[PDB]
Ligand binder design. Structure first.
Ligand SMILES: N#C/C=C/c1cccc(Oc2ccc(Cl)cc2OCCn2ccc(=O)[nH]c2=O)c1
Lengths: 548, 417
């Protein structure tokens, strides 16, 4: 039989037993159709008719494919799968084309009857037992079990991968000149060897695999480039994604928006400039599954921009280890960032985008740092190294920021490329109180029930103001107070607030937010020459004038 | 080598599975180094390759050790430690001397290699599984498990404890005033001796351990725990104050009230009665100086009701003070501080933030080890992915403390310096 391959020992989960599910059903139409299968599988040694003693059992169904000339057997292993030990996880991620090295030739072999070509641990075989039933009349069903890896069994992919690796090792040991990637069933071999000797090597690999019981394509070479693989087009000198289709509809569905931003996200890998913000901002509401969701003008504009971007094909290149790895970042202005990774000016390894969707307030520098981090992570994953950075920010700006920043930040080798828009701090608060400046003692308050509330100030020049508000909270009133003091003061202003919230927002130095109020405050702060914000504890009678 | 005796059976708390933790992506450099190291360890019988039937995984990293130009493999055993050792701090648990912190000098020696001689329980080996990752998911990783007591596992010194006691027994008799505590792969040796005599005794212990077959790979690394206390809160002292300065003072005092409830700010808060310019100079009254001075002498004397609870976890908060300075507090419960301090290392701009934070964390952890015999869980003022990416560059120790990340600091920066 298939014995030469060493079986992997398998246990049931501790404190469990093989599936005892009994199946009498169902019909006579598919039964002999099942026998016609199980006989040919028995002859090939994949299954064995079993005796009466200690059987467990698993359900068995029969079903047909299109172009019906061949039937198909299907076993539901769900219960057994529930009852079997965990295995080492098969590869979660797949290799990224931008990290592949250019090889003179690439061959794709696909082993057929993969799992059935790998033996199953003997003592475990009794738990795979299934029963072909009958019409009764004193006819006990036909019983079997698997001598090989059952299709749909929990342990099949991992054990197959392991077996394939071990089988490959004595080959690859004598052929370092060629490299074999292993993915699911498929083997992807590649080499810089001359085409003839490459082909001969491929045939040698095929025969070696065939001696271990693993079939490989006997017709032509099978697959020729492309090479449509896992959502990619792999060309000999270049790679691209699949053709991307953005549908057009009168009524957009939440599901269709999901699929839309999905395709767009996937497209962002190669096509640069893709903006996903508005369309996903639609999806922010997660409600139901079927809800028909109306578009926004910004969303349709965004989708249009993406459509114009997808108008022409864009191809990425492969990786050359002898060349530097460069990453370049641009700000798209909406809180959206885009980046290209390249070893060469006119050819990108790949592209991508970053966006901060978490939190109301932030600034350009911090976001740039975050993007740099994401790119560093991705680069470590794909190429195994960190890229050299080209960034639209100046050394003084970033030194200032990271020296003034409370968090620890890390930046690699980076150089200044002057591309508008530049990243800059639009304003800086004063670290010491200003002499010859009016001092505004500001406060705001609200009733958490009525929500009316008010905001206002009392200055040292004897000036006072109280502005009534509607539909607000203590946060909004307290920010409204600072804004109010910014409006009524000169180019140099000292503000004293009793709230840690407002102080927290302002001292964070955001250049943008989800609040129009904070934005107006930002614009005012920019218009100001000097602003000193100071904090005092409330209800201590330090000269803050409050109300209720 | 050989099995001198049978293995010590290792068990997990009933109803607990083995560790399953994803492996972090590594630089090709670190991957290569791990491949060399692990190949060599495989040739020595220390580790063996495993099949798919082993579900468990534990992370591995490559570090430069301390000053060395060659790579060291560092396994992150925190999860396995929580899943096993928490029952092994009882069964095999190693007692922590309370006199170690009182010694004038403490030297740290690396005894880890000693573990590589002793075999590990056959049944337990599958729980030590780790994966050397591959670049770009080209191949599934290289999988090993330990055939001997692994470094970084808290159960290793627990098992090796008797042997260590037997080896250290003669040295302790000739040196009864020397305190020796074993934490994981490290030996902490305290003494009141002069620096020279201390180092001489340390080299004596080194040679003793060496002639008994235990190799160790040893300014140098030495502490001085007698200076370790809770640092007092300081109020700014100035010749002439302002409205702003007094506001800062009242604020900071009002904050300090959560620690020392016996503080009265009533006089200082009155010193500016009406709305005034921030830069207006206000001379303090007699009552103001009286209250400031009364709040000063109460602030240089440590708190009341603060004791170490062995049941609760230790928590270390760190904040960045700028210019290479960092402040930290170790506490079990809010506002009750077991320890506070400040760390700074070296200028010249060759240093960066992540390096400073890393060295700070290491120092705080070592302090915590010397004092309470266990490591605190850190709250780190850094972005998660940044730390997870760059922490193994500057990491010189053999242990990994628990940590999490804090996004919400207020102005408390200057209140702690
Ligand atoms: N189904 C399907 C294939 C899937 C597949 C997936 C990943 C890799 C692969 O082939 C490769 C195998 C090994 C190496 Cl070292 C590079 C490769 O470069 C791939 C780039 N390439 C592709 C085709 C070609 O004509 N020249 C090339 O340099 C094949």
């Amino acid at each position: 039989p298939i014995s030469p391959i060493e079986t992997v020992p398998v246990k049931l989960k501790p404190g469990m037993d093989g599936p005892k599910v009994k199946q009498w059903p169902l019909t006579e139409e598919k039964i002999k159709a099942l026998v016609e299968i199980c006989t040919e599988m028995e002859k090939e040694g994949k299954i064995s008719k079993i005796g009466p003693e200690n059987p467990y059992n698993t359900p068995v169904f029969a079903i047909k494919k299109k172009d019906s000339t061949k039937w198909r057997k299907l076993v539901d292993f769900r219960e057994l799968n529930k009852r079997t030990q965990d295995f080492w996880e098969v590869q979660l991620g797949i290799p990224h084309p931008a990290g592949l090295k250019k090889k003179k030739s690439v061959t794709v072999l696909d082993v057929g009857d993969a799992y059935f070509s790998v033996p199953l641990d003997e003592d475990f075989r009794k738990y795979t037992a299934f029963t072909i039933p009958s019409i009764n009349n004193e006819t006990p069903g036909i019983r079997y079990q698997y001598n090989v890896l059952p299709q749909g069994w929990k342990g099949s992919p991992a054990i197959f991968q392991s077996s394939m690796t071990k089988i490959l090792e004595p080959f690859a040991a004598q052929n370092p000149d060629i490299v074999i990637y292993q993915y699911m069933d498929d083997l992807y071999v590649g080499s810089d060897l001359e085409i003839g000797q490459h082909r001969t090597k491929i045939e040698e690999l095929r025969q070696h695999l065939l001696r271990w019981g693993l079939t490989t394509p006997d017709k032509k070479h099978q697959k020729e480039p492309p090479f449509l693989w896992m959502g990619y087009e792999l060309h000999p000198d270049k790679w691209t994604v699949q053709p991307i289709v953005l549908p057009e509809k009168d009524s957009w569905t939440v599901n269709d928006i999901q699929k839309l931003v999905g395709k767009l996200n996937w497209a962002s890998q190669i096509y640069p400039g893709i903006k996903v913000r508005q369309l996903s901002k639609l999806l922010r509401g997660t409600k139901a599954l079927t809800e028909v969701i109306p578009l926004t003008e910004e969303a349709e504009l965004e989708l249009a921009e993406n459509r114009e971007i997808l108008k022409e094909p864009v191809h990425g290149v492969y990786y050359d280890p002898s060349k530097d790895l460069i990453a370049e970042i641009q700000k798209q202005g909406q809180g959206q960032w885009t980046y290209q990774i390249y070893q060469e000016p006119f050819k990108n390894l790949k592209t991508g985008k970053y966006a901060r969707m978490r939190g109301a307030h932030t600034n350009d520098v911090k976001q740039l740092t975050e993007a740099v981090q994401k790119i560093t992570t991705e680069s470590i994953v794909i190429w195994g190294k960190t890229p050299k950075f080209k960034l639209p920010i100046q050394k003084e700006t970033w030194e200032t920021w990271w020296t003034e920043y409370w968090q620890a930040t890390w930046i690699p080798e980076w150089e200044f490329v002057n591309t508008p828009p530049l990243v800059k701090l639009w304003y800086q608060l004063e670290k010491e109180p200003i002499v010859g400046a009016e001092t505004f003692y500001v406060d705001g308050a609200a009733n958490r029930e009525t929500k009316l509330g008010k905001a206002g100030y009392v200055t040292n020049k004897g000036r006072q103001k109280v502005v009534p508000l509607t539909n607000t909270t203590n946060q909004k009133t307290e920010l409204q107070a600072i804004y109010l003091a910014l409006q009524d003061s000169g180019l140099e202003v000292n503000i004293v607030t009793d709230s840690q919230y407002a102080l927290g927002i302002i001292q964070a130095q955001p250049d943008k937010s989800e609040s129009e109020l904070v934005n107006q405050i930002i614009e005012q702060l920019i218009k100001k020459e000097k602003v000193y914000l100071a904090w005092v504890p409330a209800h201590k009678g330090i000269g803050g004038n409050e109300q209720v | 080598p050989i099995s001198p005796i049978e293995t010590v059976p290792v068990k997990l708390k009933p109803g607990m599975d083995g560790p399953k933790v994803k492996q972090w992506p590594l630089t090709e450099e670190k991957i290569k180094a791990l491949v060399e190291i692990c190949t060599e360890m495989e040739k020595e019988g220390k580790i063996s390759k495993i099949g798919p039937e082993n579900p468990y995984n534990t992370p591995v990293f490559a570090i430069k050790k301390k000053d060395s130009t060659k790579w060291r493999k560092l396994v992150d055993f925190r999860e396995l430690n929580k899943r096993t050792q928490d029952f092994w701090e009882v069964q095999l648990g190693i007692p922590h001397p309370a006199g170690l912190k009182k010694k004038k000098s403490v030297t740290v020696l690396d005894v880890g290699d000693a573990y590589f001689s002793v075999p590990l329980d056959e049944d337990f080996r599958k729980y030590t599984a780790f994966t050397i990752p591959s670049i770009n998911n080209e191949t599934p990783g290289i999988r090993y498990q330990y055939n001997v007591l692994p470094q970084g596992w808290k159960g290793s010194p627990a098992i090796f404890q008797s042997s260590m006691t037997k080896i250290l027994e003669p040295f302790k008799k000739q040196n009864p005033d020397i305190v020796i505590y074993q934490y994981m792969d490290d030996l902490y040796v305290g003494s009141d001796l002069e620096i020279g005599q201390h180092r001489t005794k340390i080299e004596e212990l080194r040679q003793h351990l060496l002639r008994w077959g235990l190799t160790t790979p040893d300014m140098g690394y030495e502490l001085h725990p007698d200076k370790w206390t809770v640092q007092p809160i300081v109020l700014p002292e100035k010749d002439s104050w302002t409205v702003n300065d007094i506001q800062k003072l009242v604020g900071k005092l009002n904050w300090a009230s959560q620690i020392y409830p016996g503080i009265k700010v009533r006089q200082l808060s009155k010193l500016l009665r009406g709305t005034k310019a921030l830069t207006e100079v206000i001379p303090l009254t007699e009552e103001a100086e009286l209250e400031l001075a009364e709040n000063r002498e109460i602030l240089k004397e440590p708190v009341h009701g603060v004791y170490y609870d062995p049941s609760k976890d230790l928590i270390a908060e760190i904040q960045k003070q700028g210019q290479g300075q960092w402040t930290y507090q170790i506490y079990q419960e809010p506002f009750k501080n077991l320890k506070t301090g400040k760390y700074a290392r070296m200028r010249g701009a060759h240093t960066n933030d992540v390096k400073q934070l890393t060295e700070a964390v290491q120092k705080i952890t070592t302090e915590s080890i010397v004092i309470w015999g266990k490591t605190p869980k850190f709250k780190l003022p850094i972005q998660k992915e940044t730390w997870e990416t760059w922490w193994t560059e500057y990491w010189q120790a053999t242990w990994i403390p628990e940590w999490e990340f804090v996004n919400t600091p207020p102005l408390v920066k200057l209140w702690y310096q």
